[PDB]
Amino acid sequence: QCVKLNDGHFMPVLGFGTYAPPEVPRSKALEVTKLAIEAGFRHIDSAHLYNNEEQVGLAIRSKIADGSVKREDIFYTSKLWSTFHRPELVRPALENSLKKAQLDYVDLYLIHSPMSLKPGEELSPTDENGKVIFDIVDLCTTWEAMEKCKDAGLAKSIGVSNFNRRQLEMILNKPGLKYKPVCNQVECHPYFNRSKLLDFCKSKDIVLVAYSALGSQRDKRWVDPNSPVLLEDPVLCALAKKHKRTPALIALRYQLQRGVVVLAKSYNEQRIRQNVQVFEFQLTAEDMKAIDGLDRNLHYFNSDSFASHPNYPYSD
Ligand SMILES: NC(=O)c1ccc[n+]([C@@H]2O[C@H](COP(=O)([O-])OP(=O)(O)OC[C@H]3O[C@@H](n4cnc5c(N)ncnc54)[C@H](OP(=O)(O)O)[C@@H]3O)[C@@H](O)[C@H]2O)c1
Ligand SMILES: COc1cc(CN)cc(Cl)c1OCC(=O)NC(C)(C)C
């Protein structure tokens, strides 16, 4: 149930999403990550931004301590936040994430976003109009610093997140490149299926990793509540009835059959256990074509706070 990355490491194809909004106690991330591991999740997706690495790391260490898993069975991801793109900040950021999680290494470290933010101030510096304050950083220098983190053994693999094709090409074409990104973790679901970006990633042996694969958490900070609710989609519902599964399981299975590694966040015990059933059935070619027909260029994250950033990826 893993894919081989372009650096020889292996990534489980179903990952557990650990972000929950501030109104959810930090406490819960511990409980639910333990449940996820218990249910069979072996890929766990976190980030500095999520303010949960202590909890997620403790859950991992607890399941190691009680003999449920070994460290080598777990694939743990963190992400470099955008105020730390300047190359001298990259390794310290990673070391901080490792200290929070109390792990010797991460399996994967990502550049969280191509949108660099002003360093040395707040987590997300914003101007008087609520627009994030940009910084101009050559991301090929950020990437070089990421490569050094791999060479040091702090991260087994390195990749990117929220890059568009041109932004990936900038890294892939860098003189002296040592390591390609193993993946590009992007918003991806039947309303925004990223087929052309997926084709490009496949052509370069870069794994596309889907977030908001179940339609996002529809956070009021970033998501229009008028947007269609993915898990209420009539085609997904019809397919769920056909297969006697659920719309969520259809949406996850869709990604696996296109060669996309898929994340799924749930803080609910029943749904956490349900999501692992993605391995238990399959969709036909006609089912897949029906789901492909849902594409409508819908990125749920759609905010003024990001859309003017000079490296906003959806500009392309
Ligand atoms: N790289 C990035 O910039 C980026 C951006 C966004 C997200 N991510 C990562 O991707 C992960 C997942 O994306 P996401 O947070 O947008 O959420 P998601 O995976 O799209 O899930 C959306 C909602 O689906 C519900 N759900 C889960 N399983 C279900 C089921 N079987 N039936 C019905 N509902 C179900 C969950 O609610 P309950 O909790 O109530 O079950 C969850 O709030 C994040 O946690 C994070 O790790 C990365
Ligand atoms: C959802 O994305 C962001 C969240 C915060 C948190 N305050 C800050 C910034 Cl700069 C964010 O934008 C980064 C980013 O790549 N956003 C995309 C995914 C393009 C919508």
GROMACS .gro file of C-alpha atoms and ligand atoms in nm:
model
  384
    1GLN     CA    1   0.000   0.000   0.000
    2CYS     CA    2   0.297   0.232  -0.073
    3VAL     CA    3   0.439   0.403  -0.379
    4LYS     CA    4   0.813   0.419  -0.448
    5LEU     CA    5   0.942   0.776  -0.449
    6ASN     CA    6   1.202   0.902  -0.695
    7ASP     CA    7   1.472   0.888  -0.422
    8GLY     CA    8   1.405   0.520  -0.340
    9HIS     CA    9   1.200   0.574  -0.022
   10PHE     CA   10   0.840   0.447   0.004
   11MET     CA   11   0.529   0.653   0.082
   12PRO     CA   12   0.200   0.497   0.197
   13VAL     CA   13  -0.073   0.592  -0.051
   14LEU     CA   14  -0.332   0.683   0.215
   15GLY     CA   15  -0.238   0.955   0.461
   16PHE     CA   16  -0.403   1.091   0.771
   17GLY     CA   17  -0.464   1.467   0.773
   18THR     CA   18  -0.400   1.616   1.119
   19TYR     CA   19  -0.504   1.981   1.084
   20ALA     CA   20  -0.802   2.096   1.286
   21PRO     CA   21  -0.906   2.459   1.345
   22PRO     CA   22  -0.810   2.652   1.665
   23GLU     CA   23  -1.152   2.592   1.827
   24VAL     CA   24  -1.064   2.220   1.847
   25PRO     CA   25  -0.842   2.159   2.155
   26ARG     CA   26  -0.478   2.072   2.076
   27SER     CA   27  -0.547   1.768   2.295
   28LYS     CA   28  -0.765   1.602   2.030
   29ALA     CA   29  -0.479   1.567   1.778
   30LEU     CA   30  -0.315   1.316   2.015
   31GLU     CA   31  -0.630   1.105   2.053
   32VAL     CA   32  -0.722   1.099   1.684
   33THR     CA   33  -0.369   1.033   1.553
   34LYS     CA   34  -0.356   0.730   1.784
   35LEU     CA   35  -0.694   0.616   1.647
   36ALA     CA   36  -0.570   0.669   1.291
   37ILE     CA   37  -0.266   0.447   1.354
   38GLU     CA   38  -0.490   0.191   1.524
   39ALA     CA   39  -0.721   0.188   1.219
   40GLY     CA   40  -0.426   0.126   0.984
   41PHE     CA   41  -0.304   0.470   0.870
   42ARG     CA   42   0.074   0.470   0.835
   43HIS     CA   43   0.124   0.810   0.666
   44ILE     CA   44   0.064   1.111   0.893
   45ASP     CA   45   0.061   1.466   0.755
   46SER     CA   46   0.149   1.760   0.981
   47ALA     CA   47   0.321   2.100   0.953
   48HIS     CA   48   0.467   2.380   1.165
   49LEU     CA   49   0.158   2.581   1.074
   50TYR     CA   50  -0.079   2.333   1.238
   51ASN     CA   51   0.051   2.392   1.591
   52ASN     CA   52   0.004   2.021   1.660
   53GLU     CA   53   0.344   1.855   1.609
   54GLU     CA   54   0.388   1.783   1.982
   55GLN     CA   55   0.056   1.601   1.991
   56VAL     CA   56   0.109   1.416   1.663
   57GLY     CA   57   0.465   1.320   1.761
   58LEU     CA   58   0.343   1.197   2.100
   59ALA     CA   59   0.078   0.981   1.932
   60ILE     CA   60   0.347   0.827   1.710
   61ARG     CA   61   0.585   0.766   2.000
   62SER     CA   62   0.300   0.612   2.208
   63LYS     CA   63   0.214   0.360   1.934
   64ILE     CA   64   0.584   0.275   1.908
   65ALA     CA   65   0.607   0.244   2.288
   66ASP     CA   66   0.312   0.002   2.318
   67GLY     CA   67   0.450  -0.212   2.032
   68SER     CA   68   0.180  -0.140   1.770
   69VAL     CA   69   0.428  -0.004   1.512
   70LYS     CA   70   0.798   0.060   1.467
   71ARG     CA   71   0.931   0.400   1.361
   72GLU     CA   72   1.019   0.256   1.019
   73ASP     CA   73   0.650   0.163   0.966
   74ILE     CA   74   0.539   0.526   1.007
   75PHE     CA   75   0.570   0.790   0.734
   76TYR     CA   76   0.566   1.133   0.899
   77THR     CA   77   0.549   1.459   0.706
   78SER     CA   78   0.610   1.813   0.820
   79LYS     CA   79   0.633   2.134   0.625
   80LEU     CA   80   0.851   2.445   0.614
   81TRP     CA   81   0.636   2.751   0.674
   82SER     CA   82   0.659   3.045   0.435
   83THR     CA   83   0.829   3.287   0.674
   84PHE     CA   84   1.130   3.050   0.665
   85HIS     CA   85   1.205   3.035   0.291
   86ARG     CA   86   1.533   3.226   0.323
   87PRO     CA   87   1.790   2.948   0.300
   88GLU     CA   88   1.956   3.009   0.639
   89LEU     CA   89   1.614   2.951   0.807
   90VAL     CA   90   1.531   2.618   0.648
   91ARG     CA   91   1.734   2.372   0.859
   92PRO     CA   92   1.657   2.548   1.190
   93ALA     CA   93   1.284   2.533   1.103
   94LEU     CA   94   1.316   2.159   1.040
   95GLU     CA   95   1.517   2.105   1.360
   96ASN     CA   96   1.241   2.290   1.551
   97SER     CA   97   0.972   2.062   1.403
   98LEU     CA   98   1.180   1.759   1.498
   99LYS     CA   99   1.220   1.887   1.857
  100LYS     CA  100   0.843   1.949   1.884
  101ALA     CA  101   0.761   1.599   1.755
  102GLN     CA  102   1.056   1.447   1.947
  103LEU     CA  103   1.161   1.253   1.635
  104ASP     CA  104   1.512   1.197   1.495
  105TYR     CA  105   1.395   1.254   1.139
  106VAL     CA  106   1.090   1.327   0.929
  107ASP     CA  107   1.010   1.095   0.643
  108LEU     CA  108   0.917   1.396   0.434
  109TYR     CA  109   0.977   1.767   0.454
  110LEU     CA  110   0.790   2.000   0.219
  111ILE     CA  111   0.808   2.359   0.120
  112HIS     CA  112   0.453   2.432   0.241
  113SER     CA  113   0.380   2.696  -0.024
  114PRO     CA  114   0.562   2.894  -0.297
  115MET     CA  115   0.422   3.217  -0.145
  116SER     CA  116   0.713   3.354   0.060
  117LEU     CA  117   0.622   3.578   0.355
  118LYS     CA  118   0.808   3.852   0.539
  119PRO     CA  119   1.052   3.689   0.784
  120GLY     CA  120   1.136   3.773   1.144
  121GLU     CA  121   0.792   3.888   1.250
  122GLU     CA  122   0.453   3.712   1.294
  123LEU     CA  123   0.355   3.361   1.177
  124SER     CA  124   0.150   3.515   0.893
  125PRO     CA  125   0.237   3.884   0.853
  126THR     CA  126  -0.058   4.074   0.702
  127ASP     CA  127  -0.093   4.432   0.581
  128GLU     CA  128  -0.366   4.685   0.671
  129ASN     CA  129  -0.601   4.521   0.415
  130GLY     CA  130  -0.545   4.164   0.541
  131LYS     CA  131  -0.322   4.066   0.248
  132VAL     CA  132  -0.027   3.848   0.348
  133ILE     CA  133   0.302   4.043   0.327
  134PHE     CA  134   0.524   3.890   0.066
  135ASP     CA  135   0.900   3.842   0.059
  136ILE     CA  136   1.108   3.795  -0.257
  137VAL     CA  137   1.307   3.475  -0.222
  138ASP     CA  138   1.472   3.266  -0.490
  139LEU     CA  139   1.307   2.931  -0.412
  140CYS     CA  140   1.595   2.747  -0.577
  141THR     CA  141   1.807   2.867  -0.281
  142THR     CA  142   1.535   2.740  -0.045
  143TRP     CA  143   1.550   2.409  -0.232
  144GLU     CA  144   1.929   2.388  -0.198
  145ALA     CA  145   1.880   2.422   0.180
  146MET     CA  146   1.618   2.145   0.167
  147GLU     CA  147   1.868   1.921  -0.016
  148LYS     CA  148   2.119   1.978   0.267
  149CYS     CA  149   1.851   1.862   0.514
  150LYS     CA  150   1.819   1.536   0.321
  151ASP     CA  151   2.197   1.496   0.310
  152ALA     CA  152   2.212   1.553   0.687
  153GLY     CA  153   1.949   1.281   0.746
  154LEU     CA  154   1.697   1.521   0.901
  155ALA     CA  155   1.446   1.436   0.627
  156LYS     CA  156   1.445   1.106   0.439
  157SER     CA  157   1.273   1.276   0.143
  158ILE     CA  158   1.203   1.632   0.040
  159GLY     CA  159   0.923   1.777  -0.173
  160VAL     CA  160   0.698   2.075  -0.228
  161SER     CA  161   0.338   2.176  -0.175
  162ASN     CA  162   0.107   2.417  -0.356
  163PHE     CA  163   0.343   2.452  -0.653
  164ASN     CA  164   0.206   2.496  -1.004
  165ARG     CA  165   0.383   2.349  -1.308
  166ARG     CA  166   0.600   2.654  -1.375
  167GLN     CA  167   0.708   2.669  -1.010
  168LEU     CA  168   0.803   2.299  -1.020
  169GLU     CA  169   0.993   2.357  -1.345
  170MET     CA  170   1.194   2.629  -1.177
  171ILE     CA  171   1.326   2.367  -0.931
  172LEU     CA  172   1.360   2.089  -1.189
  173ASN     CA  173   1.562   2.317  -1.417
  174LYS     CA  174   1.792   2.452  -1.143
  175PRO     CA  175   2.160   2.430  -1.233
  176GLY     CA  176   2.334   2.178  -1.008
  177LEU     CA  177   2.009   2.021  -0.883
  178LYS     CA  178   2.084   1.725  -0.655
  179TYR     CA  179   1.743   1.593  -0.559
  180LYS     CA  180   1.414   1.634  -0.743
  181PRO     CA  181   1.109   1.696  -0.526
  182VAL     CA  182   0.957   1.352  -0.449
  183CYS     CA  183   0.608   1.502  -0.450
  184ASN     CA  184   0.386   1.804  -0.493
  185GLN     CA  185   0.110   1.815  -0.232
  186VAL     CA  186  -0.178   2.016  -0.377
  187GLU     CA  187  -0.551   2.075  -0.347
  188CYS     CA  188  -0.706   1.795  -0.549
  189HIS     CA  189  -1.057   1.642  -0.556
  190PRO     CA  190  -1.331   1.583  -0.817
  191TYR     CA  191  -1.417   1.954  -0.842
  192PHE     CA  192  -1.047   2.047  -0.901
  193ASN     CA  193  -0.883   1.729  -1.026
  194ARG     CA  194  -0.555   1.881  -1.149
  195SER     CA  195  -0.538   1.639  -1.443
  196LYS     CA  196  -0.282   1.842  -1.644
  197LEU     CA  197  -0.060   1.904  -1.340
  198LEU     CA  198  -0.090   1.532  -1.254
  199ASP     CA  199   0.022   1.441  -1.608
  200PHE     CA  200   0.323   1.669  -1.572
  201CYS     CA  201   0.414   1.522  -1.231
  202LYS     CA  202   0.379   1.166  -1.369
  203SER     CA  203   0.612   1.267  -1.657
  204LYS     CA  204   0.880   1.366  -1.405
  205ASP     CA  205   0.821   1.082  -1.154
  206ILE     CA  206   0.690   1.328  -0.897
  207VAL     CA  207   0.400   1.202  -0.683
  208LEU     CA  208   0.092   1.424  -0.665
  209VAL     CA  209  -0.044   1.421  -0.308
  210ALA     CA  210  -0.406   1.533  -0.273
  211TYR     CA  211  -0.532   1.749   0.011
  212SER     CA  212  -0.892   1.859   0.062
  213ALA     CA  213  -0.967   1.529  -0.114
  214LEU     CA  214  -1.297   1.515   0.074
  215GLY     CA  215  -1.388   1.876  -0.010
  216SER     CA  216  -1.197   2.059   0.265
  217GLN     CA  217  -1.302   2.162   0.614
  218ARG     CA  218  -1.477   2.463   0.458
  219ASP     CA  219  -1.308   2.696   0.703
  220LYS     CA  220  -1.483   3.034   0.707
  221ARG     CA  221  -1.150   3.217   0.690
  222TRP     CA  222  -1.075   3.093   0.339
  223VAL     CA  223  -1.370   2.904   0.189
  224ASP     CA  224  -1.689   3.042   0.038
  225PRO     CA  225  -1.984   2.870   0.209
  226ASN     CA  226  -2.171   2.898  -0.122
  227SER     CA  227  -1.924   2.655  -0.276
  228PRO     CA  228  -2.073   2.309  -0.357
  229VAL     CA  229  -2.029   2.056  -0.078
  230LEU     CA  230  -1.823   1.779  -0.234
  231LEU     CA  231  -1.958   1.496  -0.017
  232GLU     CA  232  -2.317   1.591  -0.114
  233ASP     CA  233  -2.237   1.566  -0.485
  234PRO     CA  234  -2.510   1.376  -0.674
  235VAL     CA  235  -2.267   1.174  -0.887
  236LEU     CA  236  -2.056   1.075  -0.584
  237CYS     CA  237  -2.379   0.985  -0.405
  238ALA     CA  238  -2.498   0.774  -0.698
  239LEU     CA  239  -2.162   0.594  -0.711
  240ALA     CA  240  -2.171   0.542  -0.333
  241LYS     CA  241  -2.514   0.378  -0.370
  242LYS     CA  242  -2.392   0.163  -0.662
  243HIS     CA  243  -2.098   0.033  -0.464
  244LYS     CA  244  -2.271   0.043  -0.123
  245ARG     CA  245  -1.995   0.266   0.008
  246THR     CA  246  -1.995   0.640   0.092
  247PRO     CA  247  -1.923   0.955  -0.107
  248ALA     CA  248  -1.603   1.001   0.094
  249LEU     CA  249  -1.483   0.651   0.002
  250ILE     CA  250  -1.563   0.715  -0.366
  251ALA     CA  251  -1.364   1.041  -0.356
  252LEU     CA  252  -1.064   0.870  -0.195
  253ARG     CA  253  -1.071   0.571  -0.427
  254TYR     CA  254  -1.084   0.800  -0.731
  255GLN     CA  255  -0.746   0.942  -0.635
  256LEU     CA  256  -0.581   0.606  -0.576
  257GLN     CA  257  -0.691   0.485  -0.921
  258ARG     CA  258  -0.536   0.792  -1.090
  259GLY     CA  259  -0.204   0.731  -0.913
  260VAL     CA  260  -0.252   1.014  -0.663
  261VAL     CA  261  -0.153   0.967  -0.300
  262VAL     CA  262  -0.449   1.083  -0.097
  263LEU     CA  263  -0.482   1.245   0.247
  264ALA     CA  264  -0.799   1.229   0.457
  265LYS     CA  265  -0.858   1.434   0.772
  266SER     CA  266  -1.108   1.310   1.026
  267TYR     CA  267  -1.132   1.374   1.399
  268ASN     CA  268  -1.424   1.127   1.426
  269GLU     CA  269  -1.354   0.767   1.532
  270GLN     CA  270  -1.607   0.610   1.294
  271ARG     CA  271  -1.496   0.808   0.989
  272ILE     CA  272  -1.127   0.747   1.063
  273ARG     CA  273  -1.202   0.374   1.057
  274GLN     CA  274  -1.423   0.408   0.749
  275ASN     CA  275  -1.158   0.583   0.542
  276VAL     CA  276  -0.921   0.284   0.545
  277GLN     CA  277  -1.189   0.089   0.356
  278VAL     CA  278  -1.067   0.270   0.043
  279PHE     CA  279  -0.848  -0.039  -0.014
  280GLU     CA  280  -1.148  -0.275  -0.011
  281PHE     CA  281  -1.321  -0.192  -0.341
  282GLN     CA  282  -1.260  -0.046  -0.680
  283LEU     CA  283  -1.424   0.176  -0.939
  284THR     CA  284  -1.475   0.088  -1.305
  285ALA     CA  285  -1.355   0.296  -1.602
  286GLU     CA  286  -1.707   0.433  -1.647
  287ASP     CA  287  -1.720   0.532  -1.276
  288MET     CA  288  -1.387   0.709  -1.315
  289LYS     CA  289  -1.510   0.893  -1.624
  290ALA     CA  290  -1.821   1.006  -1.436
  291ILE     CA  291  -1.603   1.148  -1.159
  292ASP     CA  292  -1.368   1.312  -1.412
  293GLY     CA  293  -1.676   1.490  -1.544
  294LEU     CA  294  -1.717   1.680  -1.215
  295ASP     CA  295  -1.408   1.901  -1.269
  296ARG     CA  296  -1.499   2.272  -1.237
  297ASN     CA  297  -1.180   2.459  -1.144
  298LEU     CA  298  -1.291   2.486  -0.779
  299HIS     CA  299  -1.018   2.553  -0.529
  300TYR     CA  300  -1.192   2.571  -0.196
  301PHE     CA  301  -0.912   2.789  -0.057
  302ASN     CA  302  -1.011   3.111  -0.228
  303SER     CA  303  -0.926   3.428  -0.039
  304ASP     CA  304  -0.825   3.791  -0.090
  305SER     CA  305  -0.557   3.729   0.175
  306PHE     CA  306  -0.361   3.510  -0.071
  307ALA     CA  307  -0.482   3.590  -0.422
  308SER     CA  308  -0.266   3.902  -0.473
  309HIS     CA  309   0.057   3.734  -0.365
  310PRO     CA  310   0.313   3.761  -0.650
  311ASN     CA  311   0.367   3.381  -0.642
  312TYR     CA  312   0.006   3.275  -0.584
  313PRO     CA  313  -0.001   2.939  -0.762
  314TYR     CA  314  -0.352   2.972  -0.905
  315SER     CA  315  -0.243   3.271  -1.114
  316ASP     CA  316  -0.164   3.003  -1.375
  317LIG     N1  317  -0.037   2.156   0.194
  317LIG     C1  318  -0.140   2.236   0.223
  317LIG     O1  319  -0.136   2.356   0.196
  317LIG     C2  320  -0.254   2.177   0.281
  317LIG     C3  321  -0.377   2.243   0.277
  317LIG     C4  322  -0.491   2.186   0.333
  317LIG     C5  323  -0.483   2.059   0.392
  317LIG     N2  324  -0.361   1.991   0.396
  317LIG     C6  325  -0.346   1.857   0.459
  317LIG     O2  326  -0.448   1.773   0.404
  317LIG     C7  327  -0.532   1.724   0.510
  317LIG     C8  328  -0.675   1.694   0.468
  317LIG     O3  329  -0.734   1.806   0.400
  317LIG     P1  330  -0.848   1.890   0.470
  317LIG     O4  331  -0.810   1.929   0.605
  317LIG     O5  332  -0.883   1.997   0.375
  317LIG     O6  333  -0.973   1.789   0.491
  317LIG     P2  334  -1.040   1.669   0.400
  317LIG     O7  335  -0.948   1.554   0.403
  317LIG     O8  336  -1.085   1.727   0.270
  317LIG     O9  337  -1.166   1.638   0.492
  317LIG     C9  338  -1.272   1.733   0.497
  317LIG    C10  339  -1.373   1.684   0.603
  317LIG    O10  340  -1.415   1.553   0.565
  317LIG    C11  341  -1.473   1.496   0.684
  317LIG     N3  342  -1.463   1.350   0.665
  317LIG    C12  343  -1.356   1.270   0.674
  317LIG     N4  344  -1.391   1.144   0.646
  317LIG    C13  345  -1.523   1.144   0.620
  317LIG    C14  346  -1.609   1.045   0.588
  317LIG     N5  347  -1.562   0.920   0.577
  317LIG     N6  348  -1.739   1.071   0.566
  317LIG    C15  349  -1.785   1.203   0.577
  317LIG     N7  350  -1.695   1.304   0.611
  317LIG    C16  351  -1.566   1.272   0.632
  317LIG    C17  352  -1.386   1.547   0.801
  317LIG    O11  353  -1.472   1.581   0.911
  317LIG     P3  354  -1.463   1.504   1.050
  317LIG    O12  355  -1.333   1.542   1.106
  317LIG    O13  356  -1.583   1.555   1.121
  317LIG    O14  357  -1.473   1.360   1.013
  317LIG    C18  358  -1.309   1.667   0.743
  317LIG    O15  359  -1.326   1.786   0.824
  317LIG    C19  360  -0.518   1.831   0.623
  317LIG    O16  361  -0.560   1.789   0.755
  317LIG    C20  362  -0.369   1.860   0.610
  317LIG    O17  363  -0.294   1.755   0.677
  317LIG    C21  364  -0.249   2.051   0.340
  318LIG     C1  365  -0.446   2.841   0.314
  318LIG     O1  366  -0.319   2.904   0.284
  318LIG     C2  367  -0.260   2.990   0.372
  318LIG     C3  368  -0.286   2.996   0.510
  318LIG     C4  369  -0.218   3.090   0.589
  318LIG     C5  370  -0.248   3.091   0.725
  318LIG     N1  371  -0.263   3.230   0.772
  318LIG     C6  372  -0.124   3.176   0.531
  318LIG     C7  373  -0.098   3.169   0.394
  318LIG    CL1  374   0.014   3.271   0.317
  318LIG     C8  375  -0.166   3.077   0.317
  318LIG     O2  376  -0.138   3.073   0.182
  318LIG     C9  377  -0.042   2.976   0.137
  318LIG    C10  378  -0.094   2.902   0.014
  318LIG     O3  379  -0.016   2.838  -0.059
  318LIG     N2  380  -0.227   2.914  -0.005
  318LIG    C11  381  -0.296   2.848  -0.118
  318LIG    C12  382  -0.293   2.696  -0.098
  318LIG    C13  383  -0.236   2.886  -0.254
  318LIG    C14  384  -0.442   2.892  -0.121
   0.00000   0.00000   0.00000
